[PDB]
């Protein structure tokens, strides 16, 4: 299993603009287009992202291209972050993927807000980090995905995704 296959399980793949779990216009493999309620503002962000007039539809290649870009940015974003980088550096390969996942979903700011849980991950207190991670709007809004990510943090294996 790898980061790409893990996020592809968490986000699915859709080739037409859709609304995410929060009601925002998205396309592809969890690629947020905009928070505006305007569908037209979404189609425009899309064309700009793809460099062609799509009319709200993209191909599998176009979806994967945005995905590659998004994973890369999530990683680069964690490495540029004074609060996230140290955590990431402290973790093993599997758990590093769990952190990329949270950042891909909620952005670097959001994750940097998990202050206490980050400190626990760093100290390798797995059970206690998992309990804290669960006391969050994140967990209450997207419980099945949160549980998978949390179990990944707790065990250091891909069991939740297998
Ligand atoms: Cl983009
Ligand atoms: Cl969920």
From Swiss-Prot:
What Pfam families does the entry give?
A: Phage_lysozyme
| Gene Ontology terms describing biological process | cell wall macromolecule catabolic process; defense response to bacterium; peptidoglycan catabolic process; viral release from host cell by cytolysis
Q: What is the effect of changing residue 30 to A?
A: Almost complete loss of enzymatic activity
Chain residues that bind substrate: 32, 104, 117, 132
Where, subcellularly, is it found? Host cytoplasm
What does UniProt list as catalytic? 11, 20
This entry's comment on induction and repression of expression is:
Expressed late in the viral replication.
Q: Which UniProt keywords apply?
A: Antimicrobial, Bacteriolytic enzyme, Cytolysis, Glycosidase, Host cell lysis by virus, Host cytoplasm, Hydrolase, Viral release from host cell
Cellular component GO terms, alphabetically?
host cell cytoplasm
Q: Its family?
A: Belongs to the glycosyl hydrolase 24 family.
Function, in words = Endolysin with lysozyme activity that degrades host peptidoglycans and participates with the holin and spanin proteins in the sequential events which lead to the programmed host cell lysis releasing the mature viral particles. Once the holin has permeabilized the host cell membrane, the endolysin can reach the periplasm and break down the peptidoglycan layer.
Q: What is this protein called?
A: Endolysin
Highest classification ranks of the organism: Viruses, Duplodnaviria, Heunggongvirae, Uroviricota, Caudoviricetes
